[PDB]
Design a protein around this ligand. Sequence first.
Ligand code: CLA
Ligand code: CLA
Ligand code: LUT
Lengths: 198, 42, 215, 153
Amino acid sequence: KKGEWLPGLASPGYLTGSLPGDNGFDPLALAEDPENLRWFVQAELVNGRWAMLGVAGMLLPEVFTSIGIIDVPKWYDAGKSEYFASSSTLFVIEFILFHYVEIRRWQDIKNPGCVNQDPIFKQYSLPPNECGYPGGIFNPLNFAPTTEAKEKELANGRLAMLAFLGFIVQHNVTGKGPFDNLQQHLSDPWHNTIIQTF
Amino acid sequence: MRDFKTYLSVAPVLSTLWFGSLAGLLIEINRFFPDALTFPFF
Amino acid sequence: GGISSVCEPLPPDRPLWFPGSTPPQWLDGSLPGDFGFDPLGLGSDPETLRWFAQAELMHSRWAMLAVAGILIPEWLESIGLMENFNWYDAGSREYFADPTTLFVVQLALMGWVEGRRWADYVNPGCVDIEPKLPNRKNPKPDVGYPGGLWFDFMMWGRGSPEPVMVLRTKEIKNGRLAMLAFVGLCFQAVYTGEGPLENLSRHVADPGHCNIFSA
Amino acid sequence: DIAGLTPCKESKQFAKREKQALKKLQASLKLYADDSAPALAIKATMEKTKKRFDNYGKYGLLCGSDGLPHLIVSGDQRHWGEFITPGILFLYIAGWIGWVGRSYLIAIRDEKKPTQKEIIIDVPLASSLLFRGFSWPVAAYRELLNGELVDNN
Ligand code: CLA
Ligand code: CLA
Ligand SMILES: CC1=C[C@H](O)CC(C)(C)[C@H]1/C=C/C(C)=C/C=C/C(C)=C/C=C/C=C(C)/C=C/C=C(C)/C=C/C1=C(C)C[C@H](O)CC1(C)C
């Protein structure tokens, strides 16, 4: 289940295969140090999960708007829309809440199993768990966190980060929605590619 | 052939090849993107 | 007695490119088309010799395909079964896509397989395409001469009718002839301003004239 | 209008400088027939000059009282492409070069005769380490965090 990103190339020594989603893809030797690899696993997990949520948010509402079920602005035009609060207050609230929750996450990263307890209602505490996969309240449906689920999550995360990079680059070069780009590609692929937008 | 490749790996020959490739790249960039005072892509 | 599937090196008294001369010490006749021709000593390093042998094989196969795809359609146009064939102007024709996007798609598709071949050359057996059937035993192929179900669906290699060395020298010799032919066609298309078979027709008639010295 | 500088697309002196350049080029052009190679070269130079002046006007550059564009490096967001963006690009490339050189020096440090690998560069290792500087900021930041960037002697 390990596999190879390049069949000819051999896997690095520090990528034995204990970590989920291990295909031996460290050509630049970024994760040679074990502390660096430990940090990069968490960074990959958080970036991939945020990319999942982001790509869903910039793809599915646009698809539903194009279908006609709802009328939602584009992901690049959603900032200028009207809400009950201004963008600055929302940013401040998000900054406060994210400071708290990400400081808690950083404490778990620095020393695992140290911030599992509620600070207000001390009778509530998370069960012992591996770093990056906090069970208990974050897993209400009690899905089994097998290594197959971790590998699937990492694969979908890598695909989502690639999709977000495609999203931002495509909007930078064409100035239109990614699903609009997909429709333009599906209109006639051989004259609607990367080439004819330059 | 190994000795000739070792000679090609010595400092002046490798420096000449590297700097010639770099100079050619810069000259071609200056031909295709001439008179660049700012970075206007962003 | 049976079918030998190993290349047999040529004897040291093999015919050479320059008879009466001493063949170089790094050319011992183990390679296809080995005639002891290395004035510049480019094959002194055995690793570079293997890389150059693979490069010569690749250039041979591409040149044979190229010269076939030039000559056979040109021979069809002269017969009359092709309306407006011209290999020099074939690149500037109108197709269903632009040449740039076709080039990018070709680059991706061909850099898949050229890179699988690279991995095979670096690590023999790392990529296997021939199926591993339950009791069929797959023989280990040489680097640059693969082929089970796909590349050698005829089983004409591996010691069948002509020994592997004989067929490999035949391939290499036809390839060298095709490389020289393709370079000649490329120079003739810009020098004579005409086609290959037309140039052959005006050279066969009055060969004392209509040459390199009369454009 | 930062520091009392008019924009180059709304500057009379910028157009005046373009007029002098085009007039000098036309005076040089008048000596040759229009179908000749020097005339074509002069015409290409004039077209390049016109494109340069139009691009300088449209780029948002601020022109001084002498008709020449003046760069602003104070960090103003309207002029981030004059210094800050090329500065970031240069810092990235220079960090790439420095990180690749440092990695090559570290790799050949524990050899029998390391100096032989400096007068004669070992090309395969250098080409292996060339692309390691693509992610030079991440590697440098982690090495600084793990205390591997510096040597305590
Ligand atoms: C591989 C074999 C080969 C063959 C059969 C031909 C055939 C032909 N060529 Mg081409 N040609 C070739 C390679 C070849 N060429 C090469 C390698 C180049 C340059 C790099 C050229 C460049 C060329 C030019 C510039 C011209 C021709 C023309 C011609 C005609 C000969 C008259 C002459 O003046 O050219 C001789 C030209 C040479 C440069 C000699 C190259 C010979 C190479 C180095 C070796 C071939 C020898 C070898 C024994 C081949 C076996 C022969 C046979 C069994 C196939 C004839 C139709 C002429 C034409 O058609 O005018 C009407 C002409 O103008 N050719
Ligand atoms: C020009 C002559 C030539 C010769 C003598 C050889 C010789 C050799 N090759 Mg090489 N090869 C060539 C050209 C040639 N090759 C080309 C152009 C390519 C690129 C496609 C390759 C790539 C290649 C591969 C990938 C493999 C070989 C292998 C071999 C062996 C098989 C025997 C043979 O090919 O049949 C000798 C007879 C012929 C070549 C006659 C010419 C064929 C005519 C022109 C057309 C074929 C007819 C018909 C259209 C095909 C059937 C139709 C069907 C698809 C419906 C032998 C050592 C195999 C290997 O070494 O494994 C041990 C291996 O699998 N070759
Ligand atoms: C690994 C490795 C290895 C070797 O060794 C070296 C190298 C190669 C260097 C490395 C690397 C690689 C790679 C490829 C990477 C990539 C990355 C990415 C792309 C990420 C993303 C990432 C991404 C992400 C997170 C994303 C996110 C997103 C989000 C939040 C979103 C948001 C939003 C939404 C929803 C909606 C609205 O309307 C808008 C907004 C507001 C905007």
